[PDB]
Write a protein that binds this ligand. Structure first.
Ligand code: AMP
Ligand code: AMP
Lengths: 125, 124
């Protein structure tokens, strides 16, 4: 059956956020992209420190001293070889619908979402 | 063969935003619910006038006096009798993947591309 590697967004195509950027710059980057969720890095683009849901930045208006770093949630890292039918079940049961994909040696390969899985599964039927 | 009415999110489960509501009240609702898109009404919950993408509110922090109305995008209203295979084609042919569902019109619910795909995968 198919694997994550067949459907992932490749590493080179990922829209990422650098945690060291000032807020006004982060906002501009996010607004320019039509995605809701961003892997976040620090110091090197493969040094992923989590996932930011864009809408969480609205808490700037609800907390006097918002630390953006505290909004970054742990990423789910999944292997390239993970099969789609199992991943679908995982995503459906989970609060996280975006995973970072890693190769057989642990390198960052890409990202994948529940939508990508559903589309490929339906595309094969 | 299956229709939108089979799989739609019922009216009662729809997270709607009153566009006239004070900013702090809007923010509280948008943050606490795990949705990216919200149908917006004015005056009457029946009067859905478009859809707000949560992330578009991030503009407020650059322009706090913006007309929030200016962020609202037009809605699409489809009949609940529409067939799922037709909707899937139509959604794939489009950038907009959320529709408001109207009865035999009055609002009866909402449906996304994800809902359509989930149903098709469950019918394998
Ligand atoms: N941060 C991102 N960088 C690149 N592609 C993404 C990102 N987030 C989501 N995607 C991809 O874009 C599609 C739509 O996701 P979304 O934009 O979050 O609705 C996903 O199903 C993936 O195909
Ligand atoms: N404003 C909303 N109110 C109620 N349900 C929604 C709303 N937006 C999306 N949904 C449903 O929840 C699912 C997840 O969408 P989202 O929360 O936008 O990722 C969709 O496929 C719809 O079934």
């Amino acid at each position: 059956e198919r694997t994550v590697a067949d459907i992932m967004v490749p590493r080179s195509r990922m829209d990422l956020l650098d945690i060291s950027q000032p807020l006004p710059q982060l906002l501009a980057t996010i607004i320019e992209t039509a995605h809701s969720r961003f892997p976040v890095y620090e110091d090197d683009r493969d040094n992923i420190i989590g996932i930011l849901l864009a809408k969480d930045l609205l808490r700037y208006m609800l907390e006097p001293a918002l630390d953006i770093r505290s909004l970054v949630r742990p990423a789910v890292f999944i292997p390239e070889v993970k099969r789609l039918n199992v991943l679908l079940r995982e995503f459906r049961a989970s609060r996280n619908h975006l995973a970072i994909v890693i190769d057989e040696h642990g390198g960052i390969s890409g990202l994948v979402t529940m939508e990508d899985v559903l589309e490929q599964i339906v595309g094969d039927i």
